[PDB]
Amino acid sequence: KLQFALPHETLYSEVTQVNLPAKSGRIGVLANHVPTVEQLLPGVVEVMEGSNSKKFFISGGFATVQPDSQLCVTAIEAPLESFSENIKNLLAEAKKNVSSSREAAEAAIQVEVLENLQSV
Amino acid sequence: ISYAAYLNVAAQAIRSTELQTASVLNRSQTDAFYTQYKNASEPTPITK
Amino acid sequence: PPSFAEQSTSAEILETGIKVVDLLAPYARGGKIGLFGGAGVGKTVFIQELINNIAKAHGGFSVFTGVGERTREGNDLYREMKETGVINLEGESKVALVFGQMNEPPGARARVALTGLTIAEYFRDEEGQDVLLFIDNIFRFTQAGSEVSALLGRIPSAVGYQPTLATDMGLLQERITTTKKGSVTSVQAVYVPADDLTDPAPATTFAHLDATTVLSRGISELGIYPAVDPLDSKSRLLD
Amino acid sequence: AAVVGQEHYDVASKVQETLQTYKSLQDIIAILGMDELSEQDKLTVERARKIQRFLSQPFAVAEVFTGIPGKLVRLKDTVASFKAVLEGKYDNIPEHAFYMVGGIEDVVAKAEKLAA
Amino acid sequence: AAVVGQEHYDVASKVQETLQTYKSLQDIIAILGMDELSEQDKLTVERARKIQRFLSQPFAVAEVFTGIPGKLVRLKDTVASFKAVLEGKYDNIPEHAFYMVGGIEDVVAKAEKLAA
Amino acid sequence: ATLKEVEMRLKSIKNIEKITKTMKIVASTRLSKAEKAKISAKKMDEAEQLFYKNAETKNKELIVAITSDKGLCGSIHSQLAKAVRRHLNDQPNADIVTIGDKIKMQLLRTHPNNIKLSINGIGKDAPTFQESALIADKLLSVMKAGTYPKISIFYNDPVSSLSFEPSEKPIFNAKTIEQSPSFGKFEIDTDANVPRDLFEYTLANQMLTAMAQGYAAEISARRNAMDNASKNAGDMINRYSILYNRTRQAVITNELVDIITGASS
Amino acid sequence: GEWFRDNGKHALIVYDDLSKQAVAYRQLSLLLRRPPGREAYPGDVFYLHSRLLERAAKLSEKEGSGSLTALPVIETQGGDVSAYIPTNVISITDGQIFLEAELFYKGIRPAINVGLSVSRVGSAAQVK
Amino acid sequence: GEWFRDNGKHALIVYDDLSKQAVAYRQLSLLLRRPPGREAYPGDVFYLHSRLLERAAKLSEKEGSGSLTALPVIETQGGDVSAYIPTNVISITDGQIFLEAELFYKGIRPAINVGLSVSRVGSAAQVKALKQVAGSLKLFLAQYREVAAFAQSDLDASTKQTLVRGERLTQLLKQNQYSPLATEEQVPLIYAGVNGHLDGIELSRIGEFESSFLSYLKSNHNELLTEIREKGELSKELLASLKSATESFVAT
Amino acid sequence: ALKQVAGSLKLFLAQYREVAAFAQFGSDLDASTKQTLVRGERLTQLLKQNQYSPLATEEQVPLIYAGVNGHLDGIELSRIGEFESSFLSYLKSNHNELLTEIREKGELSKELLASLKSATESFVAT
């Protein structure tokens, strides 16, 4: 039992395994997992239905495993290579120019999730 | 800058052409403003 | 007009053989029916089927009276009656045509209806038939009467109509009725000035109507012929 | 004012203002309704609807049509009654209580009956 | 076009189209307000309002009524002036700057005087 | 009462009726686009909020009040100001953030001094996380939402198409999440401020949820207002068409009468 | 009608309808060239109906107690009671029964519009 | 004009205008002290115009097939078709071409209000070629007028489309004064419009489109133009040729 | 004197009519729209006048002046009536020389305007 919900589209709300990009590193969650509450970093999410794998690229957010063993994932933006180089680099190269000239702070952060998306 | 503001930027980068429909370009656009109030008069309007 | 004592004491239906009419807005025998709708609604085909159906079902003839008829449209109507069979030069016709063209003086356009009506009356009185009398357009009979009245120096009434508006109408309408011998039934095309049903002309006309057949573009656009609006069409005899 | 006194004139004036404000809004009300009024206007109209009902009166000769005994109200009573309504002292009272009665007392008495 | 030239005739037509669009949209404004208009419609209304005002002119003979010195404007400046407006060269300039003046140089001059 | 007076009064109403009738249909379209934003936000509301039901998290005050800038939407703004005011009697010293001009007016009239921040130009498009976040951003920066012992979001809850409902929902702060009766049913890593983020993220999410709920409620209120407007106007049209035809008639008669009196001599 | 009234009995008289009477009188008046007034009726069209309807009366015990009750009919146009002939007759009779087209269409028949109908003197005669 | 009609020829007569003719007849009638009626017209002012206009006719073969066609003009006052003279003439003729100031100022010239104009004769009087494309033009415009108001952000697929065609079809009907077009020039333009070939082109360029498209057809497809003019009809072969020539030009 | 002070009073009251017609859309307002809506609302009030009570020119001038230049703008609307009589009573006691100049010259020199400017400001706060 999984609840996967984005603000604009609910994605999944029985599963055998979910992989989330937690605080530092990737995590696997099986049918009985001890209740945890974890942030989600801007990375990939993989739901399993048997041996069926369906990967997503995600903004970030939060996972919670409830007592009844249901997992709860939320994120703003949620298919891997099927949806996401030229689209990317035109904006991402133009971020380095914004770090010198407020706007400096946010633009700086764009680099960690842009470079992480290019690494998949 | 806050945790949801940070998450916003990380969702707006992963935004910014055919999979990029209208309600995507719109979810990245706000015409919203904030005016501060006291005593009530105001400290002049600013873009969100 | 036929005497009070000469009048039939019960309203009765004139069976047309047209489903919508007979079921939803049945014609009164010896009554008057307001026919509504302009061009592009199969009006002339509707008239021509009533002519045909009354003759085959009741053995009754028809008289069609064009009051202030466009000459172009009388020529069309005549050419179409021959193509349809309701008029047959070589054989037997079912209808008489009486025409009082728009370009004739007011006195002619005011009397044509009575000319058409008299031919229709003869079939009732002498041959004991159920007769149809078509008047297109009854409004034009009204305006002709307005014009004659004006020309005679009479002071006009409300909205410029003749002071004798109601009696002029009654002297025509009262003659269309059921007697002991038979009946004249009249189908009358009605024009509404300014779409104002409270205008003297329609208001006076409507007092004599017993039913209305409304032909509508909305019904024909749906592909329904005859293009009779089943909700708009109303009959006093639906009782 | 030279004939009736300033107070009576002032009250008459303000009744007329209130009613005129309501009259000037008929169209907006009929199409859009009360919800689209500003806050001043919504108050003024609510008060105007009462003044208007308060101007009704059971007549002795019309007893058969109203069903109620007729009332004769004195000029001085009328001035003080309306004066008070204008001062928003009866804003919490339902409109119907102002309908077809005498002076302000009758209003108060009718408002009590309806609370039952 | 055969008489005034094609350029003159085109400005005239387009000025009139802008004006009529504004007349057309005035019922959407009166009930639903300026917020509901399209992007291109908002721009047409803002240009129209300027055009309405720009068409006004202080007469020499009307000086007693206005206190404004009269202005006479050459036909060729009138065409050039209105052409510029329709092309969006003076969109940032507020309405009142177009009211009761001469040609386009006057508009520019009033705009700077109002800001100071 | 002149013919001219009547003809222009009738064309005026004929347009009002045509406008509201288009507006009602533009609304239905705008509402179906809003039911998709509302279902997708209320599901995330039960995914996000399930945690707190379990950790049993429970609660000077910050009130965030949500309507819009647009009117002709029935009594959206009025009966929400009612909810806010009724709440503001049991604690008057509260600080107020208004989202949308209409609620700012309602409240500026009745509690002018409690208002410290006003957000603007929200009416038009659907609500989005980007606004929710940027708003949540200022609450933390300028309004210092972090320090408040209590944070209430007031918003309108769409019961159906025909009816909405003014509602309140609490935002729990970092401190309050930590100290919650059953925080220990969860194996949270107490490394870097997690209850800080689980609050800043809830500030945004729960605002978005309320905005999307207020939107859907507003659009349904505007659809039904425009519906009654169209209907009332279409009634007036009838009454005025009849007055028109009387007057048209009377003008012909009266004009004829003069012509006739002049011809009697 | 009056014969019964004068001889200690009671008659009811329905004038169906005075609208058409007044249309007939206007025809004579215009043909006689009497000046047209409102809606081209003659100045004396009220009098036509007033002198007629005043004859319906309840007589005293001295005059034999006969009575003549009148139910005149008037036709409106577009449900307009403010019109000349309709208001002349309202200002003669002792009340009206107003029949509304909207009620009639819905199937409420009799289609009496209760707020616009009134009996001015009938209560005293209503069965207890 | 009847000389032409009576002698197997064809004449067109323009009465500009019948309004002012009525007014002259009314001057004589009043000064001869004949009885006045509505607007002080004499009771035979209808007869005046009906006597005149029924003289327009299409004679039979027996009588030489000659023709007289009438274009009477009537000026209304504030758009009032209920005034006495307009009422008369309207009911005598076979239809109305209605012009309006509002359309004129909009750019729409000639300023024909299509919803209010009719030809009681209809198709019978139309070159088959034009009828094959005009049939659906009447429809697309009818559907466009219903949804006109929707022209101001949240609009579904179908109504957004009706708006796209409508605007362009409306724009095609704009036409400069003194520039009447041959039928073979008319059909390719309406064909293009009705079939959707204009939808991609921006509203302001329809005018320049017409010019370029016609000269391109005169340069490269003159054979198709010639077939339209000479045969007056459109074979399925012509239709497909047109389709190809239109598709070809749109892309360029 | 009357002309000087009533410069564009007519055009301004027209601007006020426009601005008031708009605000009836229940929308929020800016400094410009709220200011003129304030001024025009007070100017209208200023012009209300009892019957049989005609004022002298020297009495009218200072009223219009206080209105048009904005000295009334921060005074409650219901109090404009009492302001009229009190301002005049104040002017008749203290600045009576001012009134005489207005009545006898019928014009306002640059000096008179300055004198009148200060005489009004003085009264605006009790």
PDB file of N, CA, C and O in Angstrom, chain A residues 10-45:
ATOM      1  N   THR A  10      -1.662  13.071  -8.714  1.00  0.00           N
ATOM      2  CA  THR A  10      -1.449  11.922  -7.835  1.00  0.00           C
ATOM      3  C   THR A  10      -0.991  10.728  -8.678  1.00  0.00           C
ATOM      4  O   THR A  10      -1.630  10.386  -9.674  1.00  0.00           O
ATOM      5  N   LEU A  11       0.113  10.101  -8.275  1.00  0.00           N
ATOM      6  CA  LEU A  11       0.724   9.028  -9.068  1.00  0.00           C
ATOM      7  C   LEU A  11       0.320   7.589  -8.707  1.00  0.00           C
ATOM      8  O   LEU A  11       0.164   6.766  -9.608  1.00  0.00           O
ATOM      9  N   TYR A  12       0.159   7.284  -7.415  1.00  0.00           N
ATOM     10  CA  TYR A  12      -0.103   5.897  -6.973  1.00  0.00           C
ATOM     11  C   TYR A  12      -1.147   5.715  -5.862  1.00  0.00           C
ATOM     12  O   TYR A  12      -1.602   4.593  -5.622  1.00  0.00           O
ATOM     13  N   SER A  13      -1.509   6.801  -5.183  1.00  0.00           N
ATOM     14  CA  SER A  13      -2.383   6.736  -4.005  1.00  0.00           C
ATOM     15  C   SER A  13      -3.757   6.141  -4.310  1.00  0.00           C
ATOM     16  O   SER A  13      -4.140   5.131  -3.726  1.00  0.00           O
ATOM     17  N   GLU A  14      -1.245  -2.237  -3.505  1.00  0.00           N
ATOM     18  CA  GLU A  14      -0.174  -3.178  -3.185  1.00  0.00           C
ATOM     19  C   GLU A  14       1.070  -2.888  -4.011  1.00  0.00           C
ATOM     20  O   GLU A  14       1.001  -2.690  -5.227  1.00  0.00           O
ATOM     21  N   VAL A  15       2.205  -2.847  -3.328  1.00  0.00           N
ATOM     22  CA  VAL A  15       3.505  -2.684  -3.969  1.00  0.00           C
ATOM     23  C   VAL A  15       4.483  -3.622  -3.260  1.00  0.00           C
ATOM     24  O   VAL A  15       4.303  -3.913  -2.077  1.00  0.00           O
ATOM     25  N   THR A  16       5.489  -4.119  -3.978  1.00  0.00           N
ATOM     26  CA  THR A  16       6.507  -4.963  -3.336  1.00  0.00           C
ATOM     27  C   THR A  16       7.727  -4.181  -2.823  1.00  0.00           C
ATOM     28  O   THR A  16       8.240  -4.486  -1.744  1.00  0.00           O
ATOM     29  N   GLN A  17       8.164  -3.166  -3.572  1.00  0.00           N
ATOM     30  CA  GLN A  17       9.336  -2.368  -3.186  1.00  0.00           C
ATOM     31  C   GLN A  17       9.379  -0.952  -3.792  1.00  0.00           C
ATOM     32  O   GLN A  17       9.116  -0.766  -4.977  1.00  0.00           O
ATOM     33  N   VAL A  18       9.715   0.040  -2.968  1.00  0.00           N
ATOM     34  CA  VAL A  18       9.904   1.412  -3.442  1.00  0.00           C
ATOM     35  C   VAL A  18      11.311   1.901  -3.086  1.00  0.00           C
ATOM     36  O   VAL A  18      11.779   1.701  -1.964  1.00  0.00           O
ATOM     37  N   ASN A  19      11.982   2.532  -4.045  1.00  0.00           N
ATOM     38  CA  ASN A  19      13.293   3.126  -3.789  1.00  0.00           C
ATOM     39  C   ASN A  19      13.230   4.646  -3.844  1.00  0.00           C
ATOM     40  O   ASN A  19      12.808   5.211  -4.848  1.00  0.00           O
ATOM     41  N   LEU A  20      13.653   5.292  -2.758  1.00  0.00           N
ATOM     42  CA  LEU A  20      13.563   6.748  -2.584  1.00  0.00           C
ATOM     43  C   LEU A  20      14.960   7.358  -2.395  1.00  0.00           C
ATOM     44  O   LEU A  20      15.836   6.705  -1.828  1.00  0.00           O
ATOM     45  N   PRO A  21      15.183   8.591  -2.849  1.00  0.00           N
ATOM     46  CA  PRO A  21      16.459   9.269  -2.601  1.00  0.00           C
ATOM     47  C   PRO A  21      16.435  10.070  -1.292  1.00  0.00           C
ATOM     48  O   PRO A  21      16.192  11.275  -1.304  1.00  0.00           O
ATOM     49  N   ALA A  22      16.702   9.391  -0.181  1.00  0.00           N
ATOM     50  CA  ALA A  22      16.579   9.966   1.164  1.00  0.00           C
ATOM     51  C   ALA A  22      17.657  11.001   1.526  1.00  0.00           C
ATOM     52  O   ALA A  22      18.405  11.467   0.658  1.00  0.00           O
ATOM     53  N   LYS A  23      17.716  11.355   2.814  1.00  0.00           N
ATOM     54  CA  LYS A  23      18.602  12.412   3.329  1.00  0.00           C
ATOM     55  C   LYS A  23      20.009  12.419   2.701  1.00  0.00           C
ATOM     56  O   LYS A  23      20.447  13.446   2.170  1.00  0.00           O
ATOM     57  N   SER A  24      20.700  11.278   2.745  1.00  0.00           N
ATOM     58  CA  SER A  24      22.021  11.157   2.115  1.00  0.00           C
ATOM     59  C   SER A  24      22.040  10.174   0.928  1.00  0.00           C
ATOM     60  O   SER A  24      22.522  10.508  -0.161  1.00  0.00           O
ATOM     61  N   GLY A  25      21.503   8.973   1.140  1.00  0.00           N
ATOM     62  CA  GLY A  25      21.560   7.921   0.125  1.00  0.00           C
ATOM     63  C   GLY A  25      20.285   7.121  -0.052  1.00  0.00           C
ATOM     64  O   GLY A  25      19.412   7.093   0.831  1.00  0.00           O
ATOM     65  N   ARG A  26      20.208   6.457  -1.205  1.00  0.00           N
ATOM     66  CA  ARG A  26      19.057   5.649  -1.624  1.00  0.00           C
ATOM     67  C   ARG A  26      18.644   4.583  -0.608  1.00  0.00           C
ATOM     68  O   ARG A  26      19.478   4.039   0.117  1.00  0.00           O
ATOM     69  N   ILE A  27      17.346   4.297  -0.571  1.00  0.00           N
ATOM     70  CA  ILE A  27      16.740   3.447   0.452  1.00  0.00           C
ATOM     71  C   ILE A  27      15.702   2.532  -0.199  1.00  0.00           C
ATOM     72  O   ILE A  27      14.996   2.945  -1.109  1.00  0.00           O
ATOM     73  N   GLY A  28      15.619   1.290   0.260  1.00  0.00           N
ATOM     74  CA  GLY A  28      14.596   0.368  -0.217  1.00  0.00           C
ATOM     75  C   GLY A  28      13.576   0.066   0.862  1.00  0.00           C
ATOM     76  O   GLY A  28      13.939  -0.154   2.017  1.00  0.00           O
ATOM     77  N   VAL A  29      12.299   0.051   0.489  1.00  0.00           N
ATOM     78  CA  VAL A  29      11.210  -0.145   1.452  1.00  0.00           C
ATOM     79  C   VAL A  29      10.308  -1.327   1.073  1.00  0.00           C
ATOM     80  O   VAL A  29       9.563  -1.269   0.088  1.00  0.00           O
ATOM     81  N   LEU A  30      10.380  -2.390   1.875  1.00  0.00           N
ATOM     82  CA  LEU A  30       9.606  -3.615   1.645  1.00  0.00           C
ATOM     83  C   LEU A  30       8.294  -3.643   2.446  1.00  0.00           C
ATOM     84  O   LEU A  30       8.059  -2.745   3.260  1.00  0.00           O
ATOM     85  N   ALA A  31       7.461  -4.671   2.219  1.00  0.00           N
ATOM     86  CA  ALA A  31       6.085  -4.774   2.788  1.00  0.00           C
ATOM     87  C   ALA A  31       5.923  -4.536   4.305  1.00  0.00           C
ATOM     88  O   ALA A  31       4.856  -4.093   4.756  1.00  0.00           O
ATOM     89  N   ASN A  32       6.960  -4.846   5.081  1.00  0.00           N
ATOM     90  CA  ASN A  32       7.031  -4.444   6.487  1.00  0.00           C
ATOM     91  C   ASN A  32       8.296  -3.609   6.738  1.00  0.00           C
ATOM     92  O   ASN A  32       9.417  -4.133   6.727  1.00  0.00           O
ATOM     93  N   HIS A  33       8.115  -2.305   6.929  1.00  0.00           N
ATOM     94  CA  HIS A  33       9.219  -1.414   7.293  1.00  0.00           C
ATOM     95  C   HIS A  33       8.822  -0.619   8.540  1.00  0.00           C
ATOM     96  O   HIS A  33       7.696  -0.103   8.627  1.00  0.00           O
ATOM     97  N   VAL A  34       9.739  -0.539   9.505  1.00  0.00           N
ATOM     98  CA  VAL A  34       9.523   0.262  10.714  1.00  0.00           C
ATOM     99  C   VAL A  34       9.320   1.748  10.359  1.00  0.00           C
ATOM    100  O   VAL A  34      10.196   2.362   9.736  1.00  0.00           O
ATOM    101  N   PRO A  35       8.158   2.300  10.734  1.00  0.00           N
ATOM    102  CA  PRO A  35       7.861   3.723  10.558  1.00  0.00           C
ATOM    103  C   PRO A  35       9.080   4.645  10.652  1.00  0.00           C
ATOM    104  O   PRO A  35       9.789   4.655  11.662  1.00  0.00           O
ATOM    105  N   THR A  36       9.325   5.377   9.567  1.00  0.00           N
ATOM    106  CA  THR A  36      10.400   6.364   9.473  1.00  0.00           C
ATOM    107  C   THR A  36       9.782   7.593   8.817  1.00  0.00           C
ATOM    108  O   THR A  36       8.753   7.482   8.146  1.00  0.00           O
ATOM    109  N   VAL A  37      10.392   8.757   9.039  1.00  0.00           N
ATOM    110  CA  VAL A  37      10.041   9.984   8.334  1.00  0.00           C
ATOM    111  C   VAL A  37      11.313  10.532   7.703  1.00  0.00           C
ATOM    112  O   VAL A  37      12.253  10.868   8.406  1.00  0.00           O
ATOM    113  N   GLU A  38      11.335  10.629   6.378  1.00  0.00           N
ATOM    114  CA  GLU A  38      12.529  11.090   5.667  1.00  0.00           C
ATOM    115  C   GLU A  38      12.251  12.163   4.604  1.00  0.00           C
ATOM    116  O   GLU A  38      11.294  12.050   3.836  1.00  0.00           O
ATOM    117  N   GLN A  39      13.096  13.195   4.575  1.00  0.00           N
ATOM    118  CA  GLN A  39      13.149  14.122   3.448  1.00  0.00           C
ATOM    119  C   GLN A  39      13.413  13.330   2.177  1.00  0.00           C
ATOM    120  O   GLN A  39      13.901  12.202   2.235  1.00  0.00           O
ATOM    121  N   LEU A  40      13.098  13.926   1.031  1.00  0.00           N
ATOM    122  CA  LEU A  40      13.477  13.377  -0.258  1.00  0.00           C
ATOM    123  C   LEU A  40      14.298  14.423  -0.996  1.00  0.00           C
ATOM    124  O   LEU A  40      13.850  15.549  -1.168  1.00  0.00           O
ATOM    125  N   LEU A  41      15.513  14.049  -1.398  1.00  0.00           N
ATOM    126  CA  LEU A  41      16.407  14.917  -2.179  1.00  0.00           C
ATOM    127  C   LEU A  41      15.987  14.881  -3.659  1.00  0.00           C
ATOM    128  O   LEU A  41      15.281  13.954  -4.063  1.00  0.00           O
ATOM    129  N   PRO A  42      16.385  15.882  -4.455  1.00  0.00           N
ATOM    130  CA  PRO A  42      16.079  15.895  -5.900  1.00  0.00           C
ATOM    131  C   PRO A  42      16.728  14.743  -6.709  1.00  0.00           C
ATOM    132  O   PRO A  42      17.741  14.954  -7.398  1.00  0.00           O
ATOM    133  N   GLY A  43      16.122  13.551  -6.639  1.00  0.00           N
ATOM    134  CA  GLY A  43      16.649  12.329  -7.278  1.00  0.00           C
ATOM    135  C   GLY A  43      15.593  11.397  -7.866  1.00  0.00           C
ATOM    136  O   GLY A  43      14.440  11.792  -8.073  1.00  0.00           O
ATOM    137  N   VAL A  44      15.987  10.151  -8.136  1.00  0.00           N
ATOM    138  CA  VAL A  44      15.106   9.179  -8.803  1.00  0.00           C
ATOM    139  C   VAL A  44      14.307   8.308  -7.826  1.00  0.00           C
ATOM    140  O   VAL A  44      14.846   7.873  -6.804  1.00  0.00           O
ATOM    141  N   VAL A  45      13.033   8.056  -8.155  1.00  0.00           N
ATOM    142  CA  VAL A  45      12.144   7.161  -7.370  1.00  0.00           C
ATOM    143  C   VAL A  45      11.704   5.918  -8.178  1.00  0.00           C
ATOM    144  O   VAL A  45      11.177   6.055  -9.285  1.00  0.00           O
TER     145      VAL A  45
END
